[PDB]
Write a protein that binds this ligand. Structure first.
Ligand SMILES: O=P(O)(O)OC[C@H]1O[C@@H](O)[C@H](O)[C@@H]1O
Lengths: 362, 354
């Protein structure tokens, strides 16, 4: 009665924890956790590491071997569309049913062979495990995190230079970790021209996330997405010569030679500007789960007005900035924002000498 | 010692908790708490309520009467005439959290030691220190402790005027912070534009309501308004509230004002009213702590003058473009974070000088 329903919450939670372990390497695939239990003991465990790699269930099955037969297989996301049939499990508990609403019902496919199925357990948590992916699936759009670095009174970088203010070493290290689980990193050409950044993940800037999993060589570099209407960023720029891909969102094709890692996407304009909504969506088709935006004032405002921001992370430095510095703060152009997907605070924490304010449209 | 030390820490903590109790009514006097222990048991407690009323030690001593003979007194501040009370009561051992801020007057402990009383100081001073930031700073430097408050949207645009765009619970919070500050400083422009009352409304408190501060004990913080030119009128709401209002003037106003209005004459400095001298003058006037409700211009002035001890920043989850822009001026003092906390849908970030 209560014994089975209370013991489920132990093992499901264990499956969620394992799923979390692939969050850095898993794109465009979702995070899935699997735990197989036989009268009181975990006979098999597994989670999804990479896109080419085996699924979580496959891993746990290989581990469990013949011990899989008896009882319960705790999963995070409905399987299939196989193994658990031949494996011989009775009972599989899936945390959530699967987004894609058409062909997304092969949960019953297991009960077809008399398995005691069941879903919905700790779904709240399993949803939060795959925000990006689940949003790309349900809606057309990737999940967007806008990062801002401002001073006490809004304002950034002391000058207009569309460069991003990187508030502290601690703030940089914090962002690295947030970058590392993001599918892609987005920026504007104006930032690349002003900062010449690498926008990669340096492994050495991660903590005990370093061990828990994500060993050195497994390091996955998020896709680098750059907006420039005009093709102002030059192939000599640091960003394109980093390991991994870097995709330019161009108003028209470039004429030059770019390293093999570079790709281009063609995006129509909208009122003299490259259309961000079409872009976002085109990145959708491209299987992009989640974007981390390192933006100047202009880009950040455009995203907010275009209603494309899911959550914004604000790093505040303990400075008040001089006469009239830039920053999204107190600057004309942004008219109908008070009247557009407004946000609410989720978390606030110290980051070295800075504070980080998490908000989300909710 | 180990038990005695832990035992001391308990009683001092209590004396600190008691001192806090009069933090709303105590100005310009410090908050002070006293616990008197007679082999194991608290035989007298007291704290300071009001400038006119008795000291914490006296209150406690009257509750202890005869029981004070034997042993220990835990005081929040070096005591004191108020030093003859303890000797007369016949206590062995007193423990003060910190010595007198004034380093001319520090020998209050020597006085008791002479009567053969076992003295000691230092215990939980960090906390005593925090209990009286302003009074302590006024004794130390010539100056009051300035708390600058700012209210803004995410994009720093000015979003805090009681139909505030910020929030209810934020107003409730601000009211609490006003209620325990000695004075509220503002500028004419704020007074002219908003016509505020700059008072504490007892109805906007909470369990502080009980904590102490009954309705009639309500002490209205001193209202201080800057106007070089004498723009504010006797008919503005600010001057008709219960309590005093003080105009920082550059030259004497000629009008008839209520008995509760004073004016302080302040010299100029490069064609503006010299803020530093104002602060000094208020210091001499015994103002412990100024809670600033100003607009951008004044906020920038105080900052550039190096006069801001801490700042309390309220942010609302709004973003703006509603020609209500601004927050700070700064025709060019830098901070470090202390506490950050939620206040309903808003956050409030406390920062201090360094
Ligand atoms: O009228 P009360 O509620 O005292 O205060 C009005 C407020 O509105 C503004 O003018 C000031 O910043 C002040 O804090």
């Amino acid at each position: 009665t209560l014994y089975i329903q209370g013991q489920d919450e132990y093992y499901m939670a264990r499956a969620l924890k394992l799923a979390q372990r692939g969050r850095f390497t898993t794109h465009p695939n979702p995070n899935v956790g699997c735990v197989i239990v036989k009268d009181g003991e975990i006979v098999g465990e597994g989670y999804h590491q990479r896109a080419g790699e085996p699924h979580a269930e496959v891993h746990a099955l290989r581990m469990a071997g013949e011990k899989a037969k008896g009882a319960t297989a705790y999963v995070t996301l409905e399987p299939c569309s196989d193994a658990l049939i031949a494996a011989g499990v009775a009972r599989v508990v899936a945390s959530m049913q699967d987004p894609n609403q058409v062909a997304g019902r092969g949960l019953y496919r297991l009960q077809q062979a008399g398995i005691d199925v069941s879903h919905g357990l700790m779904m709240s948590e399993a949803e939060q495990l795959n925000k990006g992916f689940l949003k790309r699936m349900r809606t057309g759009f990737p999940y967007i995190q806008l990062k801002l670095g401002a001073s006490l009174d809004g304002r950034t970088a002391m000058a207009s230079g569309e460069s991003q203010w990187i508030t502290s070493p601690q703030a940089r290290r914090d962002v690295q970790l947030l970058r590392a689980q993001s599918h892609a990193i987005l920026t504007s050409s104006a930032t690349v021209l002003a900062d010449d950044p690498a926008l990669t993940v340096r492994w050495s800037e991660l903590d005990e996330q370093t061990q828990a999993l994500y060993p050195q060589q497994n390091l996955r570099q998020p896709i680098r997405i750059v907006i420039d209407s005009q093709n102002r960023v030059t192939p000599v720029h640091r960003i394109v010569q980093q390991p991994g891909e870097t995709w330019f969102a161009r108003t028209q094709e470039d004429s030059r030679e770019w390293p093999e890692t570079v790709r281009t996407l063609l995006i129509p304009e909208h009122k003299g500007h490259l259309d961000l909504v079409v872009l976002m969506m085109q990145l959708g088709k491209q299987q992009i789960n989640s974007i981390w935006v390192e933006a100047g004032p202009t880009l950040a405002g455009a995203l907010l007005q275009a209603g494309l921001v899911d959550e914004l992370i604000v790093y505040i430095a303990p400075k008040l900035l001089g006469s009239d510095a830039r920053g999204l703060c107190t600057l004309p152009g942004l008219e109908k924002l008070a009247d557009a997907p407004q946000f609410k605070f989720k978390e606030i924490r110290h980051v070295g000498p800075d504070v980080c304010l998490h908000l989300v449209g909710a």
